[PDB]
Design a protein around this ligand. Structure first.
Ligand SMILES: CC(C)CCN1c2nc(Nc3cc(F)c(O)c(F)c3)ncc2N(C)C(=O)[C@H]1C
Length: 280
């Protein structure tokens, strides 16, 4: 029953390889006056191979139901367009936050990573992996909690976050997601990528071959988790073992986290998105 005429276009949020994203307002029904992001894709720009992908991307968001992953409200099509109605996130993104603070404190990082660990495990329980886990894809809501975007959802990319088995085209499993999580952790704490060369080729060679030089301002606990996430063999990596995410959750780095209070959004976030008068 849902169609494009049921949504008032306010402003265009962005545009790229995906399609065009608008900030829309629902005009009809129970959720009338509610704001959303409308992702529009033109069928003419999608090829026979690109068609199967978008299909799977909608087929994934329908299965996904987690507080730290973007919700698909509606999805519909026309003769030449494909629409996805998703959450509108006011809070911003980690990319914009990190580029502003330069580096986050251990306490800030611990919060974002704990929230992300729950979202990644949910995806892995459904047989889904996150192809491009970078800070551009981690949005923040009105309260300051994370929301993982759908751009990287799967059953090309930023090489700096790619695991050795992915650089070497050997396969993207859930273990490759725990490497990118370490890359993300490292970047948040140092303000620098762990593997970075003079160009893309040297960076990729270093992801495969370079020993990581651990900056010593990193706490003993942060260093232990990174060393364990940065194993070249994916079967040796933290999160690949018998208890999976419980290996990450039980790590000393996360010992101050209450995984129950964090899930229910009872833990106060590091950032809270957007008085003088006096009389006796
Ligand atoms: C062009 C896209 C990348 C712009 C992304 N973006 C936003 N996106 C969303 N929701 C949203 C969630 C999705 F899972 C999704 O795939 C999507 F298309 C949109 N809300 C608010 C913003 N605002 C205000 C922004 O400035 C930037 C950060």
């Amino acid at each position: 029953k849902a169609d494009p005429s049921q949504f008032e276009l306010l402003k265009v949020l962005g545009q790229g390889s995906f399609g065009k994203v608008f900030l829309v307002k629902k005009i009809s029904g129970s959720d009338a006056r509610q704001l959303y992001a409308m992702k529009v894709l033109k069928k003419a720009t999608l090829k026979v191979r690109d068609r199967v992908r978008t299909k799977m991307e909608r087929d994934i968001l329908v299965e996904v139901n987690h507080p730290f992953i973007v919700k698909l409200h509606y999805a519909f099509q026309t003769e030449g367009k494909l629409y996805l109605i998703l959450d509108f996130l006011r809070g911003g993104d980690l990319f914009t936050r990190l580029s502003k603070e330069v580096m986050f404190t251990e306490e800030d990082v611990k919060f974002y990573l704990a929230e992300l660990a729950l979202a990644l495990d949910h995806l892995h329980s459904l047989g889904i992996i996150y192809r491009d886990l970078k800070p551009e894809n981690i949005l923040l809501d009105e309260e300051g909690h994370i929301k993982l975007t759908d751009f990287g959802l799967s059953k090309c990319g930023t090489v700096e976050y790619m695991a050795p088995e992915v650089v070497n085209r050997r396969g993207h499993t859930q273990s490759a997601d725990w490497w990118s999580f370490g890359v993300l952790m490292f970047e948040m704490l140092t303000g620098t990528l762990p593997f970075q060369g003079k160009d893309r080729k040297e960076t990729m060679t270093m992801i495969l071959k370079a020993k990581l030089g651990m900056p010593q301002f990193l706490s003993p606990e942060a260093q232990s988790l990174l060393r364990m996430l940065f194993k070249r063999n994916p079967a040796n990596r933290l999160g690949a073992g018998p208890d999976g995410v419980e290996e990450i959750k039980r790590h000393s780095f996360f010992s101050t986290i209450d995984w129950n209070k964090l899930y229910r959004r009872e833990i106060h976030p590091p950032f809270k998105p957007a008085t003088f008068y006096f009389d006796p």
